[PDB]
């Protein structure tokens, strides 16, 4: 969990946005301006990232629920696979508004969702109508899109790992209102004050995003190793 200060360099972590869209709070992590862009200071970046990795690793050891948030369509697919690979569930695209707080109200929603899935191999064959059938399938699709990937939790998650943060400012606000710790790949235009582990990367190119996903994925497997057995053969 000490990704070479050079691997990210080729990934694209150094290229932020332009000044026209630059969070002034991010000054501590600036190196200059290539073609009026803002090159994140990787040397400043890297200790924080590795530190959060360790933090997140001890979490998974205590068996604290982790979570990830979907972003752009490419990001969402990548997040899903990495999450499904181990555990820790995952959001997809919308964050379903006030999921946190209204977690009890969306719990009833999850209940109805699972029933429909179960009754999707039951109610479909019997009493099928050219009208009701389309109803069932379509609603399930919509529900699945976002609610799917969270239905497993069956309770309040104990951590969150979002990306960019700005695109999901709503998610961070609710998490701050409960104590649930979070991690965010803040970029040159993202308010990091609400984050407890500022990862000053770049939510872009996917390439670099895939690096962050791969990294954390590895740390949570170390947590599972403490939950299963040590390395040997």
């Amino acid at each position: 969990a000490t990704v070479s200060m050079r691997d990210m360099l080729k990934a694209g972590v150094h290229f932020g946005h332009q000044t026209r869209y630059w969070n002034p709070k991010m000054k501590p992590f600036i190196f200059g301006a290539r073609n009026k862009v803002h090159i994140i200071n990787l040397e400043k970046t890297v200790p924080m990232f590795n530190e959060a990795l360790a933090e997140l690793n001890k979490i998974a050891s205590r068996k604290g629920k982790i979570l990830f948030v979907g972003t752009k369509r490419a990001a969402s697919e990548a997040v899903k696979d990495a999450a499904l690979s181990c555990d820790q569930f995952f959001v997809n695209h919308r964050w379903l508004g006030g999921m946190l707080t209204n977690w009890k109200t969306v719990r009833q929603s999850i209940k109805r969702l699972k029933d429909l899935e179960t009754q999707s191999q039951d109610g479909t064959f019997d009493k099928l109508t050219k009208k009701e059938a389309l109803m069932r399938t379509r609603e399930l699709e919509k529900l699945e899109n976002s609610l799917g990937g969270i239905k497993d939790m069956g309770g309040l998650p104990d951590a969150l790992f979002v990306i960019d943060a700005d695109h999901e400012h709503i998610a961070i606000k609710e998490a701050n209102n409960l104590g649930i710790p979070v991690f965010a790949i803040v970029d040159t235009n993202s308010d990091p004050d609400g984050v407890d582990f500022v990862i000053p990367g770049n939510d872009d190119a996917i390439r670099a995003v895939t690096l962050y996903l791969g990294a954390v994925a590895a740390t949570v497997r170390e947590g599972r190793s403490q939950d299963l057995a040590s390395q040997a053969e």
């Binding site: 050079r6 360099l9 080729k10 150094h14 990787l42 040397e43």
Partner: peptide, 9 residues
């Protein structure tokens, strides 16, 4: 890609 020396500077 930019040289490591300039990047580290």
């Amino acid at each position: 890609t930019e040289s490591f020396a300039q990047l580290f500077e």
